[PDB]
Structures are given as structure tokens and as C-alpha cells.
Symmetry: C2
Subunit: 103 residues, 2 copies
């Protein structure tokens, strides 16, 4: 199982966020999971350090492989109540995973 994007729906109720987030009720946030390959994957986004750590891992194991994380994020708009109970329409950055990579 290599580093790839996975489905994930968040219900603001489960996390108890529905007490301040008017709408939406929840959303598709997605998430990243998977093993960072070696030899390093081709069409897979990766930083120099991540490549180096992946190599060090093959020889020494006390050092963990690179981690599969969101490399591309988009936002969602939400209707919520702030500190003074003022309805607010705000765009929230970095909420939805659109791409994963090794870091």
C-alpha cells in the first residue's frame, strides 16, 4: 500500500463542532496514508530530505521512512457563529486533501 489519497467524511457532530458551525453539516476532507516507496517513486511528489531519509531507512531501520501527507489542499466555505454569536460566512483554508506526497 503506497502513499495515496483515501476517502474520509467528517461529521461536525461526531467531533462536536456543530455547536458553532451552522453549515455545512460535514464534508469530504479525505486523508493520506501509504508507504513511501524505495527506490523513490516517480510521479510521486517528494522533497530531497524525504528521499534522503527513505534511503537512510533502507540501511538503518531505527530511522523511520518518509511520511505520506497532504501536499495539496483546497478550502471549503462555512457558515458559523463567532465569539459574539454573529453569523459569519468565512472561507477556511487547508480543509480538503487534493493530493498526497512524502515529506
Amino acid at each position: 500500500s503506497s502513499c495515496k489519497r483515501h476517502p474520509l467524511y467528517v461529521d461536525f457532530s461526531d467531533v462536536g463542532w456543530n455547536d458553532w458551525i451552522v453549515a455545512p453539516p460535514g464534508y469530504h476532507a479525505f486523508y493520506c496514508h501509504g508507504e513511501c516507496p524505495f527506490p523513490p517513486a516517480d510521479h510521486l511528489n517528494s522533497t530531497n530530505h524525504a528521499i534522503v531519509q527513505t534511503l537512510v531507512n533502507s540501511v538503518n531501520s531505527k530511522i523511520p521512512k518518509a511520511c505520506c501527507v497532504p501536499t495539496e489542499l483546497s478550502a471549503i466555505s462555512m457558515l458559523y457563529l463567532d465569539e459574539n454569536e454573529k453569523v459569519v460566512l468565512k472561507n477556511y483554508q487547508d480543509m480538503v486533501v487534493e493530493g498526497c506526497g512524502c515529506r
Copy 2:
């Protein structure tokens, strides 16, 4: 063990990179490891999605917690031989971990 930076010295020999990297012999690359807290840490860099995934994790466990990764990287200069055996002095980006965070 929370998300923090850890010592790590890379020897270009061990990874068999000394065949093309004239100098340096190796360097302090460091790495990141540690558990991404919950409630979410204060002075710890974190993205909205990482906070949301950490929360979903507390209720559902099939979903992994956020990952501890390099959030700040610096470069090191290296002397190496390219494809035509031409000595080259190049600055290499994203080689040294200067800060970790949850993503």
C-alpha cells in the same frame, strides 16, 4: 513522545552517494518523529486538516492521527560530478530539517 526534531547524520557512503558527491562527506540532515497531540498543541505548527484528522482520530481509530514532518528546511552546498563528470558547485534545497510540525 510528541512531535519534535531529532538528530541524524547522513554519510553519503552508507547510501552509496559518495560515487558522485565529491564533498561534503556527509551532513546533519536531522529528522522528525513524535506523536501529534490532542487537544492540538499550542506552539506547534499545524494545518486545519491536520487538526481535523487528529479530532476524527480520537473518536474513530481506523483513521490515523496527523503526521509529524519537516515544516522548515534549509539547504547545504555540495561539490559533485554531473553526467559529464563536470565538477559542479550547487546549492541543494530542502536538505536540512530546521522545524517539525503536524500535517
